């Protein structure tokens, strides 16, 4: 595995170069949104984002070393977590709003257009404000995104390799903090702060998944094959 041989700076480089592009939402949507029209716009975006996510995963060091069955499993378990953290990252510089796409910046009020959605929007906004306060950097963000992919479904030959890569990502994060001039104590504290956020992201994903299976039965969500399969995986 060339992954286990990468240095910290090479790890950061590989992850930064693997970043997916930012996609646009269907243009000139009719406002205000109806429950069905908003979900239509968001599900359309998510479906296209999933295609890019699958290809981003293949570029995450070590992921290629896993079996197709495992790769499928990790993505099925982590896709929504990955969509959410990307959203929280794009929204950092926009207090109070969620930047779903450059041409689609929504406020919590618009989240009331869909039953049960405002609760999820609020958690997402709190996470974004948390990253803002922490002044989360781009190199740290890509590290966290890769940890989500490898850790979310990890729970022996395959497991050991995954744990080794996770350990390398940890080393990378500490490396970045050391360069930022943080003391040893501050490095450990920030590392803990960042990893504990992943607990909240897992929570939002579990809640989002339940709410998604809720909109589904109400025939409010469009029939986007990939998105539906990913949802059925749960």
């Amino acid at each position: 595995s060339l992954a286990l041989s990468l240095t910290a700076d090479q790890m950061v480089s590989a992850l930064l170069d693997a970043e997916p592009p930012i996609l646009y939402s269907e243009y000139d949507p009719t406002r205000p949104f109806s429950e069905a029209s908003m979900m239509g716009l968001l599900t359309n975006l998510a479906d296209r984002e999933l295609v890019h996510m699958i290809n981003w995963a293949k570029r995450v060091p070590g992921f290629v070393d896993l079996t197709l069955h495992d790769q499928v499993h990790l993505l099925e378990c982590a896709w929504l977590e990955i969509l959410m953290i990307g959203l929280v990252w794009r929204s950092m510089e926009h207090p109070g709003k969620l930047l779903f796409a450059p041409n689609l910046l929504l406020d919590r009020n618009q989240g009331k257009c869909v039953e049960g959605m405002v609760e999820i929007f609020d958690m997402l906004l709190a996470t974004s404000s948390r990253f803002r306060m922490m002044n989360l950097q781009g190199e740290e963000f890509v590290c966290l995104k890769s940890i989500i992919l490898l850790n979310s479904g990890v729970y022996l030959e395959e497991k050991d390799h995954i744990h080794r890569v996770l350990d390398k990502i940890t080393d990378t994060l500490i490396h970045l903090m050391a360069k930022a001039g943080l003391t040893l104590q501050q490095q450990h504290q920030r590392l803990a702060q960042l990893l504990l956020i992943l607990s909240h992201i897992r929570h939002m994903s579990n809640k989002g998944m339940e709410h998604l299976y809720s909109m589904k039965c109400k025939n409010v969500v469009p029939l986007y094959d990939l998105l539906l399969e990913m949802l059925d995986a749960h």
Binding site: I54, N55, V72, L75, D225, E229
Partner: peptide, 10 residues
């Protein structure tokens, strides 16, 4: 796990 399978193979 159909489409995802194929996309991961391509």
């Amino acid at each position: 796990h159909k489409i995802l399978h194929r996309l991961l193979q391509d």
